[PDB]
Design a protein around this ligand. Structure first.
Ligand SMILES: *[C@@H]1O[C@H](CO)[C@@H](O[C@@H]2O[C@H](CO)[C@@H](O[C@@H]3O[C@H](CO[C@H]4O[C@H](CO)[C@@H](O)[C@H](O)[C@@H]4O)[C@@H](O)[C@H](O)[C@@H]3O)[C@H](O)[C@H]2NC(C)=O)[C@H](O)[C@H]1NC(C)=O
Ligand SMILES: CC(=O)N[C@@H]1[C@@H](O)[C@H](O[C@@H]2O[C@H](CO[C@]3(C(=O)O)C[C@H](O)[C@@H](NC(C)=O)[C@H]([C@H](O)[C@H](O)CO)O3)[C@H](O)[C@H](O)[C@H]2O)[C@@H](CO)O[C@H]1O
Ligand SMILES: CC(=O)N[C@@H]1[C@@H](O)[C@H](O[C@@H]2O[C@H](CO[C@]3(C(=O)O)C[C@H](O)[C@@H](NC(C)=O)[C@H]([C@H](O)[C@H](O)CO)O3)[C@H](O)[C@H](O)[C@H]2O)[C@@H](CO)O[C@H]1O
Ligand SMILES: CC(=O)N[C@H]1[C@H]([C@H](O)[C@H](O)CO)O[C@@](OC[C@H]2O[C@@H](O)[C@H](O)[C@@H](O)[C@H]2O)(C(=O)O)C[C@@H]1O
Ligand SMILES: *[C@@H]1O[C@H](CO)[C@@H](O[C@@H]2O[C@H](CO)[C@@H](O)[C@H](O)[C@H]2NC(C)=O)[C@H](O)[C@H]1NC(C)=O
Ligand code: NAG
Ligand code: NAG
Ligand code: NAG
Lengths: 319, 169, 170, 318, 170, 318
């Protein structure tokens, strides 16, 4: 006459590691490291903007590729590989700081500078490198100022933008670096070129540099871009006599949003809070091994394929 | 470790499926198998408590451009920092699971021992332990008496005088 | 878990302000209650130990973030990400420290209860039997002085064994 | 006859978390996260310098607000909100690197450059924007050089400072950028302006630029500041034609100190090792949730209001 | 925690050098000592398990501060803050690791002692009684071969039960 | 008639720490914190280059000290203290990025730029500050261009390097900043000097900064270096008027290597994966307190002399 105590066991158990044993067999275990993820951008519940082949910088200066993205509001901004910033060859000083500001914003408004130019200035310069409707054009938010009468000295000019708003504005301008002395003389004259820019909080001077260089989009000239923030109630004055690519609108970055750099296609039917280059990560698990580079609210990246957490007792099957 | 599971209990019962811990018995009427609900739930509840801590869940932005070059020196500082953070989380993840698994196995062992000890003090002087997790009962115990042992309703003093005579002779 | 404190002992005694663990007895003379100093001090000393290891010698840190002036945007973003990553690590470590420490403290206190129980059980030898609820039914007349000798750890079982065994079998 | 074992309990338990249970009731518990700070900078035992409305940069160039802080010694340097660096409008290249150098220093000494200028130069330019003793003045460690005869070309001039010390010296200078041609001509003459600065470890050229821009403190012109370190034994030379704002003293940062940016008043009767914008943190707890921005020897910042550590057994009421 | 080592066992045996746990006995022929192989191995296997986890390596790191030249002051300060934060984290983790590991190692060894004690106690069944200091008083002559049978886990209690029970009762 | 259970103890226990107890005596313990390194660079199994007194920057421009390190392949590169980068006064703009690029590489190749110069140019400028085999010489990978006919204007000149390879090339050039207007006129003529450099991804202009007065003041002759990467298929053009120190070769960084800064002797018998200023660390232990600055696959630095891990039970002697 007897009664016995016992625990269960299972035919096929699973291995986990403990403090004393890397090969401990247990009745059940569950994953703690997410390994799968979704190869799409889960955008459900987000007011997103897919920039397509438009680069964030292009939004501020008005590259043709960004014509549908000159203003808007969003909580999520999506940047794609090989997006276009510059139709005319050139580069932006302090570019990664500017791209990160845009990629943090929740929108852009544009505000006219109201700049006007005297009769001896042709303000409608265009180029075959920036095309609209298959014809020569220019950056939408900027104006290529040249001497109306070719070869003549570009007049000494002043233009002031006034920020009457209650938030900071972002103003961008370019400097033209011609390909040859002859080109320089024809566009702006034989005088020495000097562009100075000043606000209450910013001061800088630029000199167009004539230089041989290789052709990009068929052109050896360059337009380099510069930018600064203009505080509420402050003014910024451009003093220039040739070589300024002048702003016709300034931008205002509005609120906050999440910036994502990914080539994954967008999925409007699933939602997510964590993104990487290859898509989204949707998991309750505290760790993931998908990528070290993520944005949003993410599981912590770990250097392991698998970490099993025991969810049962030691497995002791019958001999 | 509490000495029961993978200890003085030779092995687990694959045929038990309605609980983690349970009773097997043999008497005149035959043999029977019943799981124990209360010990089985004590274990399972502790496991689900760990699992809850596991799925408890800061917004990060990008600091490393995917599609454009990063200045080399700051790109090296970021790589060093990110790799150092990742070494820390990897270590923490390995430690969590190892320490948690250790504890889970020993807590399960503990609940087995506690059921074994509850029955032992219940049976009092009417039974003796065989050392393999069984209690040799020194009186006749029919199927209702067995259920009396599982529901913690067994009154020892009812069989005591008879049990003692059998233990002593 | 060791099966005593929220286990076979039904509940705590709010009336025992004298210490952490202790005795209640019942004999012909009457009821009474005493706290066991040794087991309570063993538990308290371990608590003290965990608190001493809590209150670390520290590194000197300097400011890398201006409170009153703007910081360049890229470096500020690097700093933000780093500090937030460090804080996530410490938040997690702090939560884990306390969750793990607490589990151990509760189980340690349970263990010290059981060790007292076990010490009294071996001391009583064959002169007593256990009910399920943490009491010992003593099978001889146990004096108030006899009771004190069980708490005092001076009780001599051989002195009462004949009497006790007769009662246990009869 | 019977003897019973038990543990104590209390009526009012405290909840703590464990590995297996969010809501576990124990007999006692204490906080591990500090939530309260001291609303004072506890400076007892520290040679501290409270800068008041003097900005660290202003100590090197001698802005009127920093007249009490041109030299000194300290192991703790306190910067206040809206401290003043510049009296004449302008800006400094690499200013946060420079501010951070000053704020980790343990003091500053000043050394004369010994620069002298001939009779064609007026080195005592002053301005309404820098008032000192009810009079128009200028940065104390700098000199505004202009032509002594107005409208005449400022002469080609060469000035050399030699560091004959055994530690590096920090030297600062300014470049004047006038707000009109008339102003530039009156100060420096009609010639082309050029300022070159060179040492064993530095070479640069600056040109004053005339440009219209808004008024700041009533003024549209600017002075931009530059700085470099002159190593022991080395020399730094200025060649200039007009537009240089020349150092009359250079600085030497001495030793090391802890830089604090804070709003809180000083308490020289209280001791502390940990500071933040609000004041000081004095605690034995390893964590705090006061502020993620602290300096000194501090508990670590954590994103939690409370973390209770059990200091007693499970509470099991009757 | 398990009440045996530094608990009801008064002290260790420096004389026992062939194992961690073991047996000393007393019969008419004299005294003896032997080590228990299985329980000492159970304990050593768990220790070596931990040592294996310890020496388990790794990520390759490059330099981000120059040993022999200067680096820009602001980034130098960021690197310093970051490296000192990382070090405080590893120092804390290193201290927690061994504090926790050591606690567990000590209690695990206590546990293996207890389980050996419990194994023996169950074997002897009704033929022996506990003295409370780790010994079993056996109530029959137990010669060297019978002692061996207890240590070897082949002691048959029913072979001595009759004799044992009437000696316990008298 | 008795059988007793028990456990071993030892004469001399070890003190370890636990969660509840500092000073817990245990029968045995081992160290988890490595405190001893090897004062040598263990290079067994590594294709390495010890640069000696050649600085990594010197490899690219060809300072005489670096003549045996102009090309090579390695998986480990070892830099020493006080190594020589320059033979003439001057410095490299953006130098720490460039040094890290080199110290991350697995080797260097050199490719001729093919530049040639008209009859008006003397491309064989040398200097007694860069001696080679006892004769006046110059950076091996650059050419100092001056006017063939002293005092006459250096001709307007264009030179284009074309990267026709499938990998980026690193091109370095120098700008000569003359010591005086008199020296500047003799080398390059009286004209205004201007050096323009442009590729598809890079453009920049440089204007030599002419020093003054004695050679011993801060503003004397120097040559400063600049660099950029030239992508596959891209061309980079120099337009220059005098003052360019032109590349005659460009470099190509190949693969990946581990860069080490140390003055510890090399040991080829000895294998390692972790290094610091003082040598190597070879340990199975997961922590070390040798240095917070290591490279390779390393145990984590900790601020602790010793952390003992129990390998035995509590030691309870009689
Ligand atoms: C930012 O740009 C703003 C636009 O230029 C600057 O505002 C200006 O500063 C000037 C000089 O202080 C002011 O000029 C004077 O105007 C008064 C007459 O003022 C009244 O009438 C005007 C015209 O209808 C009206 O707009 C005003 O609100 C007044 O009711 C004359 O007596 C003076 O001779 C002189 O011409 C401008 O008024 C002023 N604009 C405003 C709206 O303040 C501003 O200075 C720039 N900010 C910085 C930082 O420089
Ligand atoms: C000024 C002019 O017309 N000069 C003639 C050149 O156009 C011509 O060379 C060709 O120039 C082409 C680029 O032409 C544009 C352009 O699309 O980029 C034409 C624009 O109208 C003009 N816009 C402005 C505001 O000037 C623009 C601009 O001047 C330049 O971008 C500055 O570089 O140039 C293209 O590059 C061809 O490859 C090139 O041959 C030359 C030779 O025919 O003669 C000039 O008289
Ligand atoms: C051009 C020339 O020979 N002029 C004579 C000066 O050399 C001389 O001053 C002495 O100059 C010495 C440096 O001379 C070299 C050099 O650095 O070794 C000689 C090189 O041939 C020359 N190479 C080139 C490419 O020009 C070189 C170079 O011009 C300079 O380094 C640029 O500064 O200079 C040395 O510095 C002596 O200390 C100095 O006295 C003066 C006085 O004798 O007369 C000049 O005719
Ligand atoms: C060295 C010198 O020139 N000091 C002058 C000073 C400078 O010339 C000036 O700051 C360069 O801009 O100007 C001072 O006058 C400023 C004064 O000028 C008036 O014409 C104007 O109408 C006023 O608004 C005001 O800007 C000065 O104090 O700055 C005089 C000083 O002696
Ligand atoms: C670099 O310069 C070379 C010539 O200067 C350019 O190459 C020529 O390219 C055209 C069209 O691609 C070919 O028809 C010629 O045969 C090429 N010349 C030779 C001899 O190969 C090249 O395009 C330039 N690179 C850039 C980026 O501008
Ligand atoms: C970094 O985060 C803090 C927290 O909101 C914020 O004050 C600051 O502006 C952020 N800085 C940057 C780099 O934009
Ligand atoms: C609660 O804990 C704190 C610190 O452990 C102690 O000061 C206090 O006395 C405890 N309170 C009680 C109820 O004992
Ligand atoms: C600095 O000038 C002094 C005096 O002319 C001179 O002795 C010294 O050599 C110069 N320093 C350097 C490094 O040229």
């Amino acid at each position: 006459d007897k009664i016995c105590l016992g625990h269960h066991a299972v035919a096929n158990g699973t291995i986990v590691k403990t403090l004393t044993n890397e090969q401990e067999e247990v009745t059940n275990a569950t994953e703690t490291v997410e390994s799968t993820g979704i190869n799409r951008l889960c955008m459900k519940g987000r007011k997103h903007k897919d920039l397509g082949n438009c680069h964030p910088i292009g939004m501020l200066i008005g590259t043709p590729a960004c014509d549908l993205h000159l203003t808007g509001m969003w909580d999520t901004l999506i940047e794609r590989e090989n997006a276009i910033a510059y139709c005319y060859p050139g580069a932006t000083v302090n570019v990664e700081a500017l791209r990160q500001k845009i990629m943090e914003s929740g929108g852009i408004n544009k505000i006219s500078t109201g700049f006007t130019y005297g009769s001896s200035i042709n303000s409608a310069g265009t180029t075959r490198a920036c095309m609209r409707n298959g014809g020569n054009s220019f950056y939408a938010e900027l104006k290529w100022l040249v001497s109306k009468s070719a070869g003549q000295n570009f007049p000494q000019t002043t233009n002031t933008y006034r920020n009457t708003d209650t938030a900071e504005h972002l103003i961008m301008w370019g400097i033209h670096h011609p390909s040859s002395t002859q080109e320089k003389n024809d566009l702006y004259g034989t005088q020495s070129l000097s562009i100075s820019v000043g606000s209450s909080t910013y001061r800088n001077n630029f000199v167009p540099v004539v230089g041989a260089r290789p052709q990009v989009n068929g052109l050896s000239s360059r337009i380099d871009f510069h930018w600064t923030l203009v505080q509420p109630g402050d003014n910024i004055t451009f003093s220039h006599n040739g070589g300024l690519i002048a702003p016709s609108r300034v931008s205002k970055l509005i609120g906050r949003g999440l910036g994502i750099q990914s080539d994954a296609p967008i999925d409007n039917n699933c939602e997510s809070k964590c993104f990487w280059r290859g898509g989204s990560i949707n998991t309750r698990l505290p760790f993931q091994n998908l990528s070290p580079r993520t944005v949003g609210q993410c599981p912590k990246y770990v250097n392991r394929r698998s970490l099993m957490l025991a969810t049962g007792m030691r497995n002791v099957p019958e001999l | 470790l509490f000495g029961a599971i993978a200890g003085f209990l030779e092995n687990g019962w694959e045929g038990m499926v309605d609980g983690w811990y349970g009773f097997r018995h043999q008497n005149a009427q035959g043999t029977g198998q019943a799981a124990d609900y209360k010990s089985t739930q004590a274990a399972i509840d502790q496991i689900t408590g760990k699992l809850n801590r596991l799925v408890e869940k800061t917004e990060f932005e990008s600091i490393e451009s995917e599609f454009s070059e990063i200045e080399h020196q700051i790109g090296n500082v970021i790589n060093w920092t990110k790799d150092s953070i990742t070494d820390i989380w990897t270590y923490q993840a390995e430690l969590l699971v190892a320490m948690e698994n250790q504890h889970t196995i020993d807590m399960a062992d503990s609940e087995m021992l506690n059921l074994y000890e509850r029955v032992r003090k219940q049976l009092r002087q009417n039974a003796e332990e065989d050392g393999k997790g069984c209690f040799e009962i020194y009186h006749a115990c029919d199927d209702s008496c067995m259920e009396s042992i599982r529901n913690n309703t067994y009154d020892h003093s009812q069989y005591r005088e008879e049990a003692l005579l059998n233990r002593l002779n």
